[PDB]
Symmetry: C3
Subunit: 314 residues, 3 copies
């Protein structure tokens, strides 16, 4: 199977500058070379060039709506094209707002896809329920069908078409959810596994459930949108919004090892890695390495080890 | 429901100076303001003034028996008064010796209450079985009925009346128990979940069992005495007696999240936070924030989020 | 039961200098005195003096084959002697290559012994499958019967006799296994619990299984070869080959507490503690203290506590 890496150096989804550098650090860490060592054909598409929308006035509270809307429109086009060609897309991004376009494009070719969102946050705030007009916290709100029309139209997002419903998304790693978002997830009946459920059940059972919930009836393409802040700050410190009590390194790789085994991974996003937020060079290296580790795990690398087929090492 | 915060700046329960500053730090961290943001009515009773007993000679090996006996007798009076008024008491303390009065006062109004003791220690040493006359390590010994008369009367504690039996107390987090204490818990048949049981079962099953054990037959008021050293030193470093291999921040909140859900929390003690034992300002901030976190969790804050009733955020 | 501590200050099993100092640090930490406080008879045999083989040319890729072959031949003799006298041997080592002699000696007196290998690595590379001639990574390859003759004879190891088969060894903590090793463990059908299995099952079930697997049919002597790098670098940082995502302190002690309970522990190795690899004095203290902790756990110390028999502490 073919893999296509698409760089999304975008940062207008949030305050902190630096996330746009995420793609370069991931590559510098050898992400592409390491991927080629797996059983997949790896093509690197390179980073997308985002045209800055001049005079991008804030829509009420939402900031840089046009720059964010246009950047995502371009990514969706690119992701649609590669999905079309039967490849698995891998979006290396800046902030999580780029999930709008990643999933949108993906849904265009695979409308029956389901989403597994690993994040300490629900990123389901609407333009009206946001304490900060930061779009990297409102991705899911633009994608959900049940949220269509529950908020004014935002400049730059008219091209967006609600592609997934509340029954096609599973959250894993919740621990910092705003009141509005919590009202929305409870009201819409969305399935989630906050840290309390991870502690209660154990990551093993959590994965078991998330899958029977999403794949039981029909087997369908899986889109994994991974917010690096889903892990505890001790593992992925160089991120804009760290939250203590996160998932551990082990649990993160478990998640990715299990998603790899289903053979259904069709889309992937590795977001919020901000190379400039590392208090020490080591904190950035730690974060980058872990993100690379998770990506490789999604594509075969097993902690129990790997060996090439048809090769007699004896 | 009403909540009453009662500060117990006492430190004669142990050798290390500083725990008496515990209450001030917890408040400085915004404990009271944050509590008010919950669905409970919050009233701060302020800190109690403890009259120092002059010429407090040590009873054999027990140190400051009179200062400790009188400080507790006073707290018990205060806690009994607030419980009487139908409020949930919250004791912010110095050392754990103050549990004698917290639980005693509580038991006066709710004689059928059960106790969940989160501690790396059993604190069940008797005046005769202590290697150190430190009273912060003998609280349970004064409260247990089965231990009544198994040790000489100590100056300043004649007012104490054994209010709970070995079947009404559950320990969680044990890992540093003295021989005498271990002889006592095994002999008395006390129920406990040391770290080995937490590892074996997982915190989820642990909570499940501690409730069927204490609540299976009758539903009764729950008293949670929380020794901060129950969590691992990596989480609550600023404490007088840290023990490696402790409960994690996640497990701590789980315990508190589950105790909140029962709707039975009737009394609470957040002890051993010693603001002066932090090797770095960060180590004290860490400890204080975690203690505050656990308290807020005991009263509703869920990691999955919370939203106000009757409010349509859309 | 008697315990015999045998120091193996050897370091030619790998490139990093310092592991030979492991035994001295372990003793300095009070390992011997603390052991004496247990219910076992403790005898310190002292450290062995290893005669350096001059002009020890590398066998193809394998380095210091003769120095390593002779050092182990001597240890095996010593371990055989003590096992003979009905004592439990405890090898405080440098690098893990010394497991060749520890287990070999042990097997001579107890041929039906089984092995539980806690390591982040499989240390089952053969002289032909190593990327470095480092012998600390090839111990199991010299001990396995199914690997006999699958590699050339190495200078200094002719005395070695394959004493255990693929069905008598269980690995716990795997996460860094080379392709050749992974081919070998899969091909030979060896039983293992890599970190993914630990995350999936939980350490509790893992131990349960390792025992029914190795002890289900017959009860036999247990040999525990503990590579300190089996625990996460956060716990045992002072080691030559640290690997993130390891077993936790808690899980380490669980393993040792469970092995103690079987009453079958017959041989033990506490390897790879390198006092010179600690970035800070604290990192070395941490590592040394944990290694001592695990050892004491193997011999009785329970986290729930301990009390001497026939003694009425009341
Ligand atoms: N970090 C983050 N999401 O990823 N924060 C979400 C928070 N609700 C906000 O609206 O800004
Ligand atoms: N820290 C602590 N309990 O909380 N230590 C208990 C120890 N048994 C002592 O008797 O002093
Ligand atoms: N550290 C370690 N084993 O313990 N490394 C094993 C690695 N296969 C090597 O062959 O050097
Ligand atoms: Mn996030
Ligand atoms: Mn996010
Ligand atoms: Mn304690
Ligand atoms: Mn205590
Ligand atoms: Mn190793
Ligand atoms: Mn090893």
């Amino acid at each position: 199977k073919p893999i296509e890496i698409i760089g999304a150096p975008f940062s207008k989804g949030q305050p902190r500058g630096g996330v746009e550098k995420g793609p370069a650090a991931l590559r510098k860490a050898g992400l592409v070379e390491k991927l080629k060592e797996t059983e997949y054909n790896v093509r690197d598409h390179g980073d997308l060039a985002f045209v800055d929308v001049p005079n991008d006035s804030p829509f009420q509270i939402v900031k840089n709506p046009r720059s964010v809307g246009k950047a995502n429109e371009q990514l969706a086009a690119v992701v649609a094209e590669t999905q079309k060609n039967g490849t698995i897309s891998v979006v290396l991004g800046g902030d999580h707002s780029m999930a709008i376009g990643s999933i949108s494009g993906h849904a265009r070719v695979h409308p029956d896809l389901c989403v597994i969102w690993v994040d300490a946050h629900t990123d389901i705030n609407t333009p009206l329920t946001t304490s900060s007009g930061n779009l990297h916290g409102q991705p899911v709100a633009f994608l959900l069908k049940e949220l269509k029309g529950k908020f004014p139209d935002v400049p730059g997002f008219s091209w967006v078409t609600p592609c997934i419903s509340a029954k096609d998304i599973v959250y894993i790693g919740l621990r910092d959810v705003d009141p509005g978002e919590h009202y929305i997830i409870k009201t819409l009946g969305i399935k989630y596994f906050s840290m309390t459920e991870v502690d209660k059940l154990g990551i093993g059972k959590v994965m078991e459930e998330t899958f029977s919930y999403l794949l039981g009836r029909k087997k369908r393409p899986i889109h994994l949108s991974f917010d690096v802040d889903g892990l505890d700050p001790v593992f992925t410190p160089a991120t804009g919004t760290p939250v203590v009590g996160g998932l551990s390194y082990r649990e993160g790789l478990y998640i990715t090892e299990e998603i790899y085994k289903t053979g259904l991974l069709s889309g992937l996003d590795i977001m919020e890695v901000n190379p400039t937020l590392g208090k020490t060079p080591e904190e950035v290296t730690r974060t980058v390495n872990t993100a690379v580790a998770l990506t490789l795990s999604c594509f075969g690398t097993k902690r129990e080890g790997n060996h090439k087929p048809e090769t007699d090492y004896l």
